[PDB]
PDB file of C-alpha atoms in Angstrom:
ATOM      1  CA  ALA A   1       1.683  23.995 -33.529  1.00 35.54           C
ATOM      2  CA  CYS A   2      -0.508  22.664 -36.247  1.00 34.07           C
ATOM      3  CA  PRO A   3      -0.053  18.886 -37.377  1.00 31.77           C
ATOM      4  CA  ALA A   4      -1.280  18.550 -40.678  1.00 31.73           C
ATOM      5  CA  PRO A   5      -4.451  16.346 -41.287  1.00 30.69           C
ATOM      6  CA  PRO A   6      -5.307  13.460 -41.764  1.00 29.85           C
ATOM      7  CA  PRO A   7      -6.732  12.873 -45.586  1.00 24.31           C
ATOM      8  CA  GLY A   8     -10.502  11.874 -45.259  1.00 24.90           C
ATOM      9  CA  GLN A   9     -11.513   8.312 -47.395  1.00 24.71           C
ATOM     10  CA  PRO A  10     -14.743   9.033 -48.755  1.00 29.46           C
ATOM     11  CA  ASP A  11     -15.889   4.964 -47.397  1.00 28.87           C
ATOM     12  CA  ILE A  12     -15.656   2.922 -44.546  1.00 26.10           C
ATOM     13  CA  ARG A  13     -14.663   0.004 -44.525  1.00 24.74           C
ATOM     14  CA  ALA A  14     -15.991  -1.936 -40.434  1.00 24.47           C
ATOM     15  CA  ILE A  15     -17.093  -5.775 -40.189  1.00 24.19           C
ATOM     16  CA  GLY A  16     -19.082  -7.028 -37.727  1.00 23.73           C
ATOM     17  CA  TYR A  17     -17.610  -9.176 -34.764  1.00 22.16           C
ATOM     18  CA  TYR A  18     -20.861 -10.684 -33.030  1.00 20.16           C
ATOM     19  CA  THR A  19     -21.092 -14.588 -33.491  1.00 21.45           C
ATOM     20  CA  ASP A  20     -24.598 -14.862 -32.092  1.00 23.51           C
ATOM     21  CA  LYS A  21     -28.495 -14.029 -33.165  1.00 22.77           C
ATOM     22  CA  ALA A  22     -28.143 -12.845 -29.791  1.00 18.72           C
ATOM     23  CA  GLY A  23     -25.040  -9.630 -30.653  1.00 21.56           C
ATOM     24  CA  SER A  24     -22.298 -10.622 -27.557  1.00 21.39           C
ATOM     25  CA  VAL A  25     -19.823 -12.490 -27.735  1.00 21.98           C
ATOM     26  CA  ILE A  26     -16.771 -11.536 -30.472  1.00 22.01           C
ATOM     27  CA  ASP A  27     -15.665 -13.008 -32.512  1.00 21.68           C
ATOM     28  CA  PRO A  28     -11.791 -11.885 -31.592  1.00 21.81           C
ATOM     29  CA  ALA A  29     -10.327 -12.330 -35.577  1.00 21.47           C
ATOM     30  CA  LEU A  30     -12.943  -9.887 -36.631  1.00 19.00           C
ATOM     31  CA  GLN A  31     -12.641  -7.355 -33.943  1.00 20.25           C
ATOM     32  CA  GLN A  32      -8.954  -7.302 -34.997  1.00 18.24           C
ATOM     33  CA  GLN A  33      -9.893  -7.404 -38.480  1.00 19.10           C
ATOM     34  CA  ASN A  34     -12.593  -3.547 -37.471  1.00 17.91           C
ATOM     35  CA  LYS A  35     -10.075  -2.704 -35.504  1.00 15.10           C
ATOM     36  CA  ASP A  36      -7.600  -2.220 -37.758  1.00 12.61           C
ATOM     37  CA  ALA A  37      -9.971  -1.513 -40.698  1.00  8.69           C
ATOM     38  CA  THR A  38     -11.371   1.927 -38.661  1.00  7.66           C
ATOM     39  CA  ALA A  39      -8.429   2.865 -36.808  1.00  6.38           C
ATOM     40  CA  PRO A  40      -7.754   5.542 -38.896  1.00  5.56           C
ATOM     41  CA  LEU A  41     -11.483   6.740 -38.386  1.00  7.02           C
ATOM     42  CA  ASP A  42     -10.809   6.733 -34.971  1.00  7.89           C
ATOM     43  CA  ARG A  43      -7.158   8.060 -34.776  1.00  6.68           C
ATOM     44  CA  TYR A  44      -9.231  10.938 -36.030  1.00  5.19           C
ATOM     45  CA  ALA A  45     -11.946  10.891 -34.275  1.00  4.48           C
ATOM     46  CA  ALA A  46     -10.051  10.946 -29.987  1.00  4.91           C
ATOM     47  CA  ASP A  47      -7.308  13.750 -32.247  1.00  2.00           C
ATOM     48  CA  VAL A  48     -10.359  16.431 -33.335  1.00  2.19           C
ATOM     49  CA  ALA A  49     -11.693  15.659 -30.108  1.00  2.00           C
ATOM     50  CA  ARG A  50      -8.525  15.757 -28.236  1.00  2.23           C
ATOM     51  CA  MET A  51      -7.811  19.775 -29.657  1.00  2.04           C
ATOM     52  CA  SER A  52     -11.445  20.511 -28.403  1.00  5.39           C
ATOM     53  CA  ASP A  53     -10.892  18.989 -24.601  1.00  6.23           C
ATOM     54  CA  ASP A  54      -7.693  21.296 -24.679  1.00  8.07           C
ATOM     55  CA  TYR A  55      -9.309  24.365 -25.543  1.00 11.09           C
ATOM     56  CA  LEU A  56     -12.178  23.895 -23.350  1.00  8.50           C
ATOM     57  CA  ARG A  57      -9.599  23.242 -20.757  1.00  5.34           C
ATOM     58  CA  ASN A  58      -8.102  26.682 -20.953  1.00  4.47           C
ATOM     59  CA  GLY A  59      -8.772  28.663 -23.806  1.00  3.63           C
ATOM     60  CA  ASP A  60      -6.174  28.725 -26.111  1.00  5.17           C
ATOM     61  CA  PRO A  61      -7.404  29.430 -29.191  1.00  6.30           C
ATOM     62  CA  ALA A  62      -4.334  27.190 -32.140  1.00  4.99           C
ATOM     63  CA  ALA A  63      -6.487  24.091 -30.362  1.00  2.00           C
ATOM     64  CA  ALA A  64      -9.683  25.991 -31.528  1.00  2.00           C
ATOM     65  CA  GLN A  65      -8.085  26.688 -35.010  1.00  2.00           C
ATOM     66  CA  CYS A  66      -6.624  23.103 -34.967  1.00  2.00           C
ATOM     67  CA  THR A  67      -9.648  21.184 -34.789  1.00  2.39           C
ATOM     68  CA  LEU A  68     -11.844  23.412 -36.835  1.00  2.00           C
ATOM     69  CA  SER A  69      -8.676  23.209 -39.644  1.00  2.00           C
ATOM     70  CA  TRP A  70      -8.850  19.303 -39.144  1.00  2.65           C
ATOM     71  CA  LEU A  71     -12.502  19.593 -39.575  1.00  2.00           C
ATOM     72  CA  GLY A  72     -12.657  21.905 -42.975  1.00  2.00           C
ATOM     73  CA  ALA A  73      -9.910  19.701 -44.465  1.00  2.00           C
ATOM     74  CA  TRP A  74     -11.935  16.294 -43.590  1.00  2.00           C
ATOM     75  CA  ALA A  75     -15.122  18.544 -44.819  1.00  2.00           C
ATOM     76  CA  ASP A  76     -13.530  20.275 -48.346  1.00  2.00           C
ATOM     77  CA  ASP A  77     -12.227  16.059 -48.776  1.00  2.00           C
ATOM     78  CA  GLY A  78     -15.994  14.549 -48.857  1.00  2.00           C
ATOM     79  CA  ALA A  79     -14.905  12.160 -45.762  1.00  2.00           C
ATOM     80  CA  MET A  80     -17.317   8.984 -44.962  1.00  2.00           C
ATOM     81  CA  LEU A  81     -19.588  10.877 -47.629  1.00  2.00           C
ATOM     82  CA  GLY A  82     -18.754   7.580 -50.207  1.00  2.00           C
ATOM     83  CA  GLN A  83     -20.037   4.008 -50.439  1.00  2.00           C
ATOM     84  CA  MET A  84     -20.927   2.991 -46.513  1.00  2.00           C
ATOM     85  CA  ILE A  85     -19.684  -0.781 -48.059  1.00  2.00           C
ATOM     86  CA  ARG A  86     -20.547  -3.684 -45.956  1.00  2.00           C
ATOM     87  CA  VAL A  87     -18.560  -6.589 -44.868  1.00  2.00           C
ATOM     88  CA  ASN A  88     -21.171  -9.220 -42.897  1.00  2.00           C
ATOM     89  CA  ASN A  89     -23.620  -5.985 -41.908  1.00  2.00           C
ATOM     90  CA  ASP A  90     -24.376  -2.468 -41.021  1.00  2.00           C
ATOM     91  CA  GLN A  91     -20.859  -2.259 -38.898  1.00  2.00           C
ATOM     92  CA  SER A  92     -19.825   0.387 -41.709  1.00  2.00           C
ATOM     93  CA  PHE A  93     -23.241   2.695 -41.239  1.00  2.00           C
ATOM     94  CA  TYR A  94     -22.646   2.438 -37.478  1.00  2.00           C
ATOM     95  CA  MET A  95     -19.558   2.926 -37.396  1.00  2.00           C
ATOM     96  CA  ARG A  96     -20.486   7.235 -39.615  1.00  2.00           C
ATOM     97  CA  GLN A  97     -23.056   7.527 -37.042  1.00  2.00           C
ATOM     98  CA  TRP A  98     -20.434   6.791 -34.217  1.00  2.00           C
ATOM     99  CA  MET A  99     -17.853   9.137 -36.292  1.00  2.00           C
ATOM    100  CA  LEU A 100     -20.824  12.592 -36.812  1.00  2.00           C
ATOM    101  CA  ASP A 101     -21.299  12.065 -32.969  1.00  2.00           C
ATOM    102  CA  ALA A 102     -17.306  12.863 -33.075  1.00  2.00           C
ATOM    103  CA  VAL A 103     -17.280  15.026 -35.520  1.00  2.00           C
ATOM    104  CA  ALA A 104     -20.053  17.044 -34.938  1.00  2.00           C
ATOM    105  CA  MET A 105     -19.392  17.219 -30.615  1.00  2.00           C
ATOM    106  CA  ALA A 106     -15.816  18.556 -31.741  1.00  2.00           C
ATOM    107  CA  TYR A 107     -17.415  21.356 -33.455  1.00  2.00           C
ATOM    108  CA  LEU A 108     -19.748  22.268 -31.347  1.00  2.00           C
ATOM    109  CA  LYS A 109     -17.247  22.783 -28.716  1.00  2.00           C
ATOM    110  CA  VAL A 110     -14.861  24.780 -30.725  1.00  2.00           C
ATOM    111  CA  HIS A 111     -18.378  27.093 -33.470  1.00  2.00           C
ATOM    112  CA  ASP A 112     -17.565  30.353 -31.032  1.00  2.00           C
ATOM    113  CA  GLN A 113     -14.034  30.529 -32.852  1.00  2.00           C
ATOM    114  CA  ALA A 114     -14.972  29.035 -36.623  1.00  2.00           C
ATOM    115  CA  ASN A 115     -14.650  32.109 -39.260  1.00  2.00           C
ATOM    116  CA  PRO A 116     -17.749  32.286 -41.695  1.00  2.00           C
ATOM    117  CA  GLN A 117     -15.260  30.599 -43.737  1.00  2.00           C
ATOM    118  CA  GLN A 118     -14.898  27.800 -41.622  1.00  2.00           C
ATOM    119  CA  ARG A 119     -17.961  27.351 -40.971  1.00  2.00           C
ATOM    120  CA  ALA A 120     -19.221  27.388 -44.878  1.00  2.00           C
ATOM    121  CA  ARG A 121     -16.884  24.891 -45.872  1.00  2.00           C
ATOM    122  CA  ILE A 122     -18.070  22.586 -41.869  1.00  2.00           C
ATOM    123  CA  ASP A 123     -21.741  22.870 -41.733  1.00  2.00           C
ATOM    124  CA  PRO A 124     -22.519  21.139 -44.973  1.00  2.00           C
ATOM    125  CA  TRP A 125     -20.481  18.523 -44.459  1.00  2.00           C
ATOM    126  CA  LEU A 126     -22.290  17.901 -40.882  1.00  2.00           C
ATOM    127  CA  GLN A 127     -25.431  18.412 -42.559  1.00  2.00           C
ATOM    128  CA  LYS A 128     -25.352  15.664 -44.981  1.00  2.00           C
ATOM    129  CA  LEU A 129     -23.654  13.141 -42.770  1.00  2.00           C
ATOM    130  CA  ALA A 130     -26.263  13.676 -40.584  1.00  2.00           C
ATOM    131  CA  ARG A 131     -29.371  12.614 -43.382  1.00  2.00           C
ATOM    132  CA  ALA A 132     -27.674   9.868 -44.986  1.00  2.00           C
ATOM    133  CA  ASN A 133     -27.542   8.602 -41.441  1.00  2.00           C
ATOM    134  CA  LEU A 134     -31.134   9.511 -40.848  1.00  2.00           C
ATOM    135  CA  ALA A 135     -32.517   8.295 -44.395  1.00  2.00           C
ATOM    136  CA  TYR A 136     -30.662   4.697 -42.779  1.00  2.00           C
ATOM    137  CA  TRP A 137     -33.710   4.728 -39.880  1.00  2.00           C
ATOM    138  CA  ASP A 138     -36.548   4.981 -43.040  1.00  2.00           C
ATOM    139  CA  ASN A 139     -36.579   1.711 -43.952  1.00  2.00           C
ATOM    140  CA  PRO A 140     -38.944   0.031 -41.124  1.00  2.00           C
ATOM    141  CA  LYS A 141     -37.936  -3.096 -40.712  1.00  2.00           C
ATOM    142  CA  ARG A 142     -34.584  -1.667 -38.875  1.00  2.00           C
ATOM    143  CA  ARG A 143     -35.466  -1.705 -34.737  1.00  2.00           C
ATOM    144  CA  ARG A 144     -34.804   1.255 -33.514  1.00  2.00           C
ATOM    145  CA  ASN A 145     -32.192  -0.434 -30.771  1.00  2.00           C
ATOM    146  CA  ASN A 146     -29.291   1.796 -28.690  1.00  2.00           C
ATOM    147  CA  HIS A 147     -28.016   2.787 -32.586  1.00  2.00           C
ATOM    148  CA  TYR A 148     -30.954   5.084 -32.804  1.00  2.00           C
ATOM    149  CA  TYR A 149     -29.848   6.603 -29.320  1.00  2.00           C
ATOM    150  CA  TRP A 150     -26.580   6.874 -31.267  1.00  2.00           C
ATOM    151  CA  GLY A 151     -27.443   7.917 -34.646  1.00  2.00           C
ATOM    152  CA  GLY A 152     -30.256  11.475 -32.353  1.00  2.00           C
ATOM    153  CA  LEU A 153     -26.736  12.281 -30.857  1.00  2.00           C
ATOM    154  CA  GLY A 154     -24.909  13.664 -34.188  1.00  2.00           C
ATOM    155  CA  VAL A 155     -28.422  14.239 -36.162  1.00  2.00           C
ATOM    156  CA  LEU A 156     -28.695  17.128 -32.721  1.00  2.00           C
ATOM    157  CA  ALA A 157     -25.072  17.661 -32.058  1.00  2.00           C
ATOM    158  CA  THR A 158     -25.748  19.064 -36.586  1.00  2.00           C
ATOM    159  CA  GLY A 159     -28.544  20.286 -36.112  1.00  2.00           C
ATOM    160  CA  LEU A 160     -27.859  22.735 -32.842  1.00  2.00           C
ATOM    161  CA  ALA A 161     -23.499  23.677 -34.559  1.00  2.00           C
ATOM    162  CA  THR A 162     -25.074  23.933 -37.716  1.00  2.00           C
ATOM    163  CA  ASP A 163     -28.731  25.878 -37.139  1.00  2.00           C
ATOM    164  CA  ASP A 164     -30.743  23.252 -38.450  1.00  2.00           C
ATOM    165  CA  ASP A 165     -34.102  22.941 -37.484  1.00  2.00           C
ATOM    166  CA  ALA A 166     -35.032  19.466 -39.366  1.00  2.00           C
ATOM    167  CA  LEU A 167     -32.581  18.290 -37.783  1.00  2.00           C
ATOM    168  CA  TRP A 168     -32.820  19.548 -34.728  1.00  2.00           C
ATOM    169  CA  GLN A 169     -36.209  18.042 -35.029  1.00  2.00           C
ATOM    170  CA  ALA A 170     -34.875  14.810 -35.692  1.00  2.00           C
ATOM    171  CA  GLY A 171     -32.243  14.672 -32.941  1.00  2.00           C
ATOM    172  CA  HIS A 172     -35.115  14.951 -30.642  1.00  2.00           C
ATOM    173  CA  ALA A 173     -37.607  12.500 -32.101  1.00  2.00           C
ATOM    174  CA  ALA A 174     -35.168  10.016 -31.942  1.00  2.00           C
ATOM    175  CA  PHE A 175     -34.337  11.328 -28.280  1.00  2.00           C
ATOM    176  CA  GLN A 176     -38.035  10.108 -27.457  1.00  2.00           C
ATOM    177  CA  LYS A 177     -38.638   7.849 -28.230  1.00  2.00           C
ATOM    178  CA  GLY A 178     -35.478   6.075 -26.136  1.00  2.00           C
ATOM    179  CA  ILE A 179     -37.322   7.830 -23.209  1.00  2.00           C
ATOM    180  CA  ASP A 180     -40.644   6.211 -23.973  1.00  2.00           C
ATOM    181  CA  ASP A 181     -38.308   2.566 -24.214  1.00  2.00           C
ATOM    182  CA  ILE A 182     -38.508   2.969 -20.953  1.00  2.00           C
ATOM    183  CA  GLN A 183     -40.283   0.267 -18.998  1.00  2.00           C
ATOM    184  CA  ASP A 184     -41.608   0.661 -15.284  1.00  2.00           C
ATOM    185  CA  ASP A 185     -38.242  -1.410 -13.668  1.00  2.00           C
ATOM    186  CA  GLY A 186     -35.536   1.234 -16.760  1.00  2.00           C
ATOM    187  CA  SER A 187     -34.991  -1.960 -18.589  1.00  2.00           C
ATOM    188  CA  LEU A 188     -35.258  -1.598 -22.706  1.00  2.00           C
ATOM    189  CA  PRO A 189     -36.905  -4.610 -24.186  1.00  2.00           C
ATOM    190  CA  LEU A 190     -34.055  -4.178 -27.408  1.00  2.00           C
ATOM    191  CA  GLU A 191     -31.259  -3.828 -25.590  1.00  2.00           C
ATOM    192  CA  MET A 192     -32.226  -6.938 -23.183  1.00  2.00           C
ATOM    193  CA  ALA A 193     -32.492  -8.880 -25.698  1.00  2.00           C
ATOM    194  CA  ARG A 194     -28.616  -8.561 -25.588  1.00  2.00           C
ATOM    195  CA  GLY A 195     -28.012 -12.248 -23.880  1.00  2.00           C
ATOM    196  CA  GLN A 196     -24.111 -11.144 -21.536  1.00  2.00           C
ATOM    197  CA  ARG A 197     -23.838  -7.850 -22.572  1.00  2.00           C
ATOM    198  CA  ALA A 198     -27.751  -6.903 -22.244  1.00  2.00           C
ATOM    199  CA  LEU A 199     -25.895  -4.372 -19.230  1.00  2.00           C
ATOM    200  CA  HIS A 200     -23.370  -3.393 -20.963  1.00  2.00           C
ATOM    201  CA  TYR A 201     -25.919  -1.882 -23.844  1.00  2.00           C
ATOM    202  CA  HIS A 202     -28.393  -0.256 -21.392  1.00  2.00           C
ATOM    203  CA  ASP A 203     -24.921   1.575 -20.283  1.00  2.00           C
ATOM    204  CA  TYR A 204     -24.242   2.398 -23.743  1.00  2.00           C
ATOM    205  CA  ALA A 205     -28.164   3.493 -25.204  1.00  2.00           C
ATOM    206  CA  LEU A 206     -27.670   5.505 -21.761  1.00  2.00           C
ATOM    207  CA  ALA A 207     -25.153   7.596 -21.864  1.00  2.00           C
ATOM    208  CA  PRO A 208     -26.184   9.230 -26.206  1.00  2.00           C
ATOM    209  CA  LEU A 209     -29.309  10.136 -24.253  1.00  2.00           C
ATOM    210  CA  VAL A 210     -28.048  11.778 -21.391  1.00  2.00           C
ATOM    211  CA  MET A 211     -25.333  13.693 -23.752  1.00  2.00           C
ATOM    212  CA  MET A 212     -28.660  14.219 -26.279  1.00  2.00           C
ATOM    213  CA  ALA A 213     -30.440  16.012 -23.363  1.00  2.00           C
ATOM    214  CA  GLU A 214     -27.330  17.776 -22.142  1.00  2.00           C
ATOM    215  CA  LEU A 215     -27.161  19.785 -25.728  1.00  2.00           C
ATOM    216  CA  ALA A 216     -30.663  20.328 -25.024  1.00  2.00           C
ATOM    217  CA  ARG A 217     -29.454  21.743 -21.939  1.00  2.00           C
ATOM    218  CA  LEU A 218     -27.807  24.202 -24.049  1.00  2.00           C
ATOM    219  CA  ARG A 219     -30.270  25.111 -25.899  1.00  2.00           C
ATOM    220  CA  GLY A 220     -32.046  26.087 -21.939  1.00  2.00           C
ATOM    221  CA  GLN A 221     -34.745  23.039 -22.377  1.00  2.00           C
ATOM    222  CA  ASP A 222     -34.789  20.472 -19.510  1.00  2.00           C
ATOM    223  CA  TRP A 223     -35.261  16.802 -21.091  1.00  2.00           C
ATOM    224  CA  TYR A 224     -34.727  14.675 -18.654  1.00  2.00           C
ATOM    225  CA  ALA A 225     -38.020  15.968 -17.136  1.00  2.00           C
ATOM    226  CA  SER A 226     -39.294  14.929 -20.074  1.00  2.00           C
ATOM    227  CA  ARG A 227     -42.262  11.390 -18.314  1.00  2.00           C
ATOM    228  CA  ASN A 228     -42.097  12.774 -14.939  1.00  2.00           C
ATOM    229  CA  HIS A 229     -38.034  11.587 -15.366  1.00  2.00           C
ATOM    230  CA  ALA A 230     -38.317   8.860 -17.264  1.00  2.00           C
ATOM    231  CA  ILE A 231     -34.687   8.926 -17.160  1.00  2.00           C
ATOM    232  CA  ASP A 232     -33.824   8.142 -13.297  1.00  2.00           C
ATOM    233  CA  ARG A 233     -35.623   4.459 -13.647  1.00  2.00           C
ATOM    234  CA  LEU A 234     -32.838   3.533 -16.439  1.00  2.00           C
ATOM    235  CA  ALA A 235     -30.754   5.819 -14.660  1.00  2.00           C
ATOM    236  CA  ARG A 236     -30.775   4.422 -11.980  1.00  2.00           C
ATOM    237  CA  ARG A 237     -30.957   0.554 -13.370  1.00  2.00           C
ATOM    238  CA  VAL A 238     -27.609   1.235 -14.318  1.00  2.00           C
ATOM    239  CA  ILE A 239     -25.709   2.046 -12.141  1.00  2.00           C
ATOM    240  CA  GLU A 240     -27.118  -0.113  -9.395  1.00  2.00           C
ATOM    241  CA  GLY A 241     -26.699  -3.423 -11.552  1.00  2.00           C
ATOM    242  CA  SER A 242     -22.516  -1.951 -12.260  1.00  2.00           C
ATOM    243  CA  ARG A 243     -22.792  -2.401  -8.302  1.00  2.00           C
ATOM    244  CA  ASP A 244     -24.676  -6.016  -8.748  1.00  2.00           C
ATOM    245  CA  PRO A 245     -25.044  -7.622 -12.205  1.00  2.00           C
ATOM    246  CA  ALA A 246     -27.995 -10.096  -9.756  1.00  2.00           C
ATOM    247  CA  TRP A 247     -31.372  -8.123 -11.937  1.00  2.00           C
ATOM    248  CA  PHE A 248     -30.212  -8.515 -14.974  1.00  2.00           C
ATOM    249  CA  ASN A 249     -28.470 -11.554 -14.769  1.00  2.00           C
ATOM    250  CA  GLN A 250     -32.547 -12.997 -13.406  1.00  2.00           C
ATOM    251  CA  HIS A 251     -34.115 -10.496 -16.566  1.00  2.00           C
ATOM    252  CA  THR A 252     -31.923 -12.484 -19.255  1.00  2.00           C
ATOM    253  CA  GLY A 253     -30.739 -15.618 -20.803  1.00  2.00           C
ATOM    254  CA  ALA A 254     -27.039 -15.529 -20.083  1.00  2.00           C
ATOM    255  CA  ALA A 255     -24.366 -14.317 -16.767  1.00  2.00           C
ATOM    256  CA  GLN A 256     -23.764 -10.293 -17.573  1.00  2.00           C
ATOM    257  CA  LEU A 257     -19.571  -9.215 -18.151  1.00  2.00           C
ATOM    258  CA  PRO A 258     -19.798  -6.923 -15.681  1.00  2.00           C
ATOM    259  CA  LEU A 259     -20.125  -3.287 -16.281  1.00  2.00           C
ATOM    260  CA  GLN A 260     -17.968   0.096 -14.715  1.00  2.00           C
ATOM    261  CA  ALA A 261     -20.284   2.913 -16.232  1.00  2.00           C
ATOM    262  CA  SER A 262     -19.569   5.141 -18.836  1.00  2.00           C
ATOM    263  CA  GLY A 263     -18.991   9.345 -18.579  1.00  2.00           C
ATOM    264  CA  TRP A 264     -22.962   9.690 -18.839  1.00  2.00           C
ATOM    265  CA  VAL A 265     -22.083   9.709 -14.662  1.00  2.00           C
ATOM    266  CA  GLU A 266     -20.169  12.819 -15.000  1.00  2.00           C
ATOM    267  CA  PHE A 267     -23.563  15.125 -15.732  1.00  2.00           C
ATOM    268  CA  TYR A 268     -25.800  12.901 -14.254  1.00  2.00           C
ATOM    269  CA  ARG A 269     -23.719  12.956 -10.430  1.00  2.00           C
ATOM    270  CA  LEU A 270     -24.680  16.988 -11.591  1.00  2.00           C
ATOM    271  CA  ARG A 271     -28.104  17.117 -12.555  1.00  2.00           C
ATOM    272  CA  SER A 272     -28.772  14.352 -10.283  1.00  2.00           C
ATOM    273  CA  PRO A 273     -30.643  15.099  -6.538  1.00  2.00           C
ATOM    274  CA  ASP A 274     -28.698  12.496  -5.515  1.00  2.00           C
ATOM    275  CA  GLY A 275     -25.728  12.851  -6.936  1.00  2.00           C
ATOM    276  CA  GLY A 276     -23.382   9.913  -4.147  1.00  2.00           C
ATOM    277  CA  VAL A 277     -25.317   6.569  -5.869  1.00  2.00           C
ATOM    278  CA  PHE A 278     -22.554   7.822  -8.327  1.00  2.00           C
ATOM    279  CA  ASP A 279     -19.192   8.346  -6.217  1.00  2.00           C
ATOM    280  CA  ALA A 280     -17.826   4.779  -7.425  1.00  2.00           C
ATOM    281  CA  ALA A 281     -18.437   5.330 -10.618  1.00  2.00           C
ATOM    282  CA  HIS A 282     -16.848   8.703 -10.653  1.00  2.00           C
ATOM    283  CA  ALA A 283     -14.067   7.934  -9.439  1.00  2.00           C
ATOM    284  CA  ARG A 284     -13.007   5.319 -12.345  1.00  2.00           C
ATOM    285  CA  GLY A 285     -12.777   8.408 -14.339  1.00  2.00           C
ATOM    286  CA  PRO A 286     -11.553  10.590 -16.075  1.00  2.00           C
ATOM    287  CA  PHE A 287     -13.528   9.027 -19.117  1.00  2.00           C
ATOM    288  CA  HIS A 288     -12.587   9.894 -22.254  1.00  2.00           C
ATOM    289  CA  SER A 289     -15.680   8.777 -25.080  1.00  2.00           C
ATOM    290  CA  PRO A 290     -14.111  10.554 -29.086  1.00  2.00           C
ATOM    291  CA  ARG A 291     -17.694   9.126 -29.237  1.00  2.00           C
ATOM    292  CA  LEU A 292     -20.017  11.116 -26.981  1.00  2.00           C
ATOM    293  CA  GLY A 293     -17.861  13.925 -27.401  1.00  2.00           C
ATOM    294  CA  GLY A 294     -14.443  13.578 -25.573  1.00  2.00           C
ATOM    295  CA  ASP A 295     -13.563  14.724 -21.994  1.00  2.00           C
ATOM    296  CA  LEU A 296     -16.322  13.723 -20.659  1.00  2.00           C
ATOM    297  CA  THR A 297     -15.319  15.015 -16.736  1.00  2.00           C
ATOM    298  CA  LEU A 298     -14.260  17.917 -17.877  1.00  2.00           C
ATOM    299  CA  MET A 299     -17.264  18.387 -20.272  1.00  2.00           C
ATOM    300  CA  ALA A 300     -19.415  17.987 -17.025  1.00  2.00           C
ATOM    301  CA  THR A 301     -16.417  20.157 -15.076  1.00  2.00           C
ATOM    302  CA  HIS A 302     -17.001  23.465 -17.264  1.00  2.00           C
ATOM    303  CA  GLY A 303     -19.548  22.892 -19.632  1.00  2.00           C
ATOM    304  CA  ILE A 304     -19.127  21.344 -23.307  1.00  2.00           C
ATOM    305  CA  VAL A 305     -19.005  25.201 -24.771  1.00  2.00           C
ATOM    306  CA  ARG A 306     -17.090  27.396 -23.827  1.00  2.00           C
ATOM    307  CA  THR A 307     -19.046  31.115 -24.624  1.00  2.00           C
ATOM    308  CA  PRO A 308     -23.498  30.358 -24.612  1.00  2.00           C
TER     309      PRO A 308
END
């Protein structure tokens, strides 16, 4: 039933693929080279996200056990604890943040089924990847753009699934830095600097912010309400951009790639007073993003976890 997990490689070798200062114009060769270099990591991430999707779909214990088995194996292997191997940038470090987000959300989805010895393998592994990730943001030079929000989501998810307050606190701080970056006009200055991908990077900064408030909701906290619902200025800026890129074109130094809004809409439409603004985006799913915990359509409908 449960296939043999792939080996866990202790190192990540990722490749940056933007040619401009604005981090907006893709070199096709470097992108493919990145794709082939991360393919095992992407496959693993997809696989645990999918098996945890199945657990939530119908309660099948065999799905949870297989998800847990896959996570235990990469824990036992010390996967991604090795050197983050730079090539042209910190793409490897970004990859470990996204990989934590995937594996930590996968774990959280199936935690109810985890036996004491599975928790003792998996918990310490998530906790070191989480700390390893944070340590990168201690350097005062690294601007805390959308990547800091992606860092936060897995640090928070790990904090929640492993019951480590240090990492819950550090998650919360990432989220709140994000909410307080949201200008009066719903823009984020560090994302506005991303030329033709400025609108894409607002969608990409909002997603982990929404999933972090969704985790806060698992603890019965409402973080959507931070700063008199400041998050709703970003959501409105993004859902309107996806319909019409004109505001972004007028406020950036390049013509925007048009946006299909990502699966954060599945959650936001259910929280939001007036979800109808999300009808077109919702029609373009289902939304699968292992990075954000797998099947966002399933998790918005049925919850991120089966038993509180």
